[PDB]
Design a protein around this motif. Structure first.
Motif, PDB file in Angstrom:
ATOM      1  N   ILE A  80      -6.171   4.669  -5.157  1.00  0.00           N
ATOM      2  CA  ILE A  80      -5.141   3.663  -4.946  1.00  0.00           C
ATOM      3  C   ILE A  80      -5.466   2.711  -6.077  1.00  0.00           C
ATOM      4  CG2 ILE A  80      -4.205   1.883  -3.633  1.00  0.00           C
ATOM      5  CD1 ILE A  80      -5.538   3.151  -1.082  1.00  0.00           C
ATOM      6  N   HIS A  81      -4.493   2.486  -6.964  1.00  0.00           N
ATOM      7  CA  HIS A  81      -4.717   1.661  -8.134  1.00  0.00           C
ATOM      8  C   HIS A  81      -3.603   0.721  -8.563  1.00  0.00           C
ATOM      9  CE1 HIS A  81      -2.906   5.495  -9.638  1.00  0.00           C
ATOM     10  NE2 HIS A  81      -2.174   4.633 -10.317  1.00  0.00           N
ATOM     11  N   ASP A  82      -3.933  -0.260  -9.406  1.00  0.00           N
ATOM     12  CA  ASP A  82      -2.888  -1.154  -9.923  1.00  0.00           C
ATOM     13  C   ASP A  82      -2.502  -0.659 -11.306  1.00  0.00           C
ATOM     14  OD1 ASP A  82      -5.203  -1.881 -11.309  1.00  0.00           O
ATOM     15  OD2 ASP A  82      -5.141  -3.990 -10.761  1.00  0.00           O
ATOM     16  N   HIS A  83      -1.794  -1.481 -12.065  1.00  0.00           N
ATOM     17  CA  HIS A  83      -1.371  -1.089 -13.395  1.00  0.00           C
ATOM     18  C   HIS A  83      -1.479  -2.192 -14.439  1.00  0.00           C
ATOM     19  CE1 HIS A  83       0.410   2.053 -10.769  1.00  0.00           C
ATOM     20  NE2 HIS A  83      -0.144   2.799 -11.711  1.00  0.00           N
ATOM     21  N   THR A  84      -2.574  -2.944 -14.328  1.00  0.00           N
ATOM     22  CA  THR A  84      -2.908  -3.999 -15.268  1.00  0.00           C
ATOM     23  C   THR A  84      -1.716  -4.691 -15.818  1.00  0.00           C
ATOM     24  OG1 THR A  84      -4.630  -2.507 -15.885  1.00  0.00           O
ATOM     25  CG2 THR A  84      -4.284  -4.442 -17.275  1.00  0.00           C
ATOM     26  N   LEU A 134       0.677  -1.432  -5.031  1.00  0.00           N
ATOM     27  CA  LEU A 134      -0.391  -0.620  -5.593  1.00  0.00           C
ATOM     28  C   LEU A 134       0.000   0.791  -5.232  1.00  0.00           C
ATOM     29  CD1 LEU A 134      -3.594  -2.429  -4.251  1.00  0.00           C
ATOM     30  CD2 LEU A 134      -2.589  -2.427  -6.589  1.00  0.00           C
ATOM     31  N   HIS A 135      -0.551   1.809  -5.858  1.00  0.00           N
ATOM     32  CA  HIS A 135      -0.191   3.116  -5.315  1.00  0.00           C
ATOM     33  C   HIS A 135      -1.209   4.199  -5.507  1.00  0.00           C
ATOM     34  CE1 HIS A 135       2.128   5.139  -8.933  1.00  0.00           C
ATOM     35  NE2 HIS A 135       0.887   4.797  -9.245  1.00  0.00           N
ATOM     36  N   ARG A 136      -0.973   5.297  -4.807  1.00  0.00           N
ATOM     37  CA  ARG A 136      -1.818   6.475  -4.871  1.00  0.00           C
ATOM     38  C   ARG A 136      -0.816   7.566  -5.089  1.00  0.00           C
ATOM     39  NH1 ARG A 136      -5.366   6.997  -0.038  1.00  0.00           N
ATOM     40  NH2 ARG A 136      -3.322   7.439   1.019  1.00  0.00           N
TER      41      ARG A 136
HETATM   42 FE   FE2 Z   1      -0.232   4.712 -10.923  1.00  0.00          FE
END
Ligand code: FE2
Length: 185
Positions: A80-84, A134-136
């Motif tokens: 699960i991550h952001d995108h700066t 945020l997404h996975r």
């Molecule tokens: Fe992504």
């Protein structure tokens, strides 16, 4: 919508789209989606790993963006991550990804909340940024691979990875498995 006949045309058009200072997200999404994936045109970037997905840089968009291809092996998924803080588009080139959107965690610690969940279809182009969530993302198959084309603007070297159980995060340097069809160090 203007229809790239080949990945080359698409890239060409992207250089124009991101040349300015303004970006019409809707418009880019449309043009990426219009491109009809052709393995012949992108196989040279389709380099898989047995254990995790791979990032293969495709074009550096004159400093304006990163166009890359991610190769998801059977059952591979991301964190699960952001995108700066950048724009991020992802279009399916082969197979299917399940995208799960999450809400940003608070200072408090606890199970992250799902805000949306879907499957990207053939040649479908999705869009996301930090103000959206945020997404996975995951390969839905455990027998077939998945391949997607990704564009970020401005480009970014790092992102945050979130722990679904607490919302705790940690910085991650993003690396490339290959660049321009060439396996890296
Ligand atoms: Fe992504």
């Amino acid at each position: 919508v203007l229809k790239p006949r080949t990945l080359a045309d698409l890239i060409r058009i992207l250089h124009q789209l991101f040349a300015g200072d303004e970006v019409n997200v809707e418009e880019v999404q449309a043009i990426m989606e219009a491109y009809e994936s052709d393995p012949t045109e992108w196989a040279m970037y389709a380099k898989f790993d047995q254990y995790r997905y791979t990032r293969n840089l495709v074009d550096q968009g004159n400093g304006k963006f990163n166009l890359m291809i991610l190769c998801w092996g059977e059952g591979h998924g991301s964190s699960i991550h952001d995108h700066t803080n950048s724009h991020c588009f992802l279009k399916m080139l082969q197979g299917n990804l399940k995208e799960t959107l999450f809400a940003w965690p608070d200072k408090k610690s606890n199970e992250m909340v799902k805000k949306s969940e879907r499957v990207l279809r053939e040649n479908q182009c999705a869009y996301i940024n930090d103000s959206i969530g945020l997404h996975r993302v995951e390969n839905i198959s455990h027998t077939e691979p998945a391949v997607s084309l990704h564009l970020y603007s401005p480009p970014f070297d790092t992102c945050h990875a979130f722990d679904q159980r607490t919302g705790h995060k940690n910085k991650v340097t993003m690396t490339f498995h290959s660049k321009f069809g060439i396996r890296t160090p």
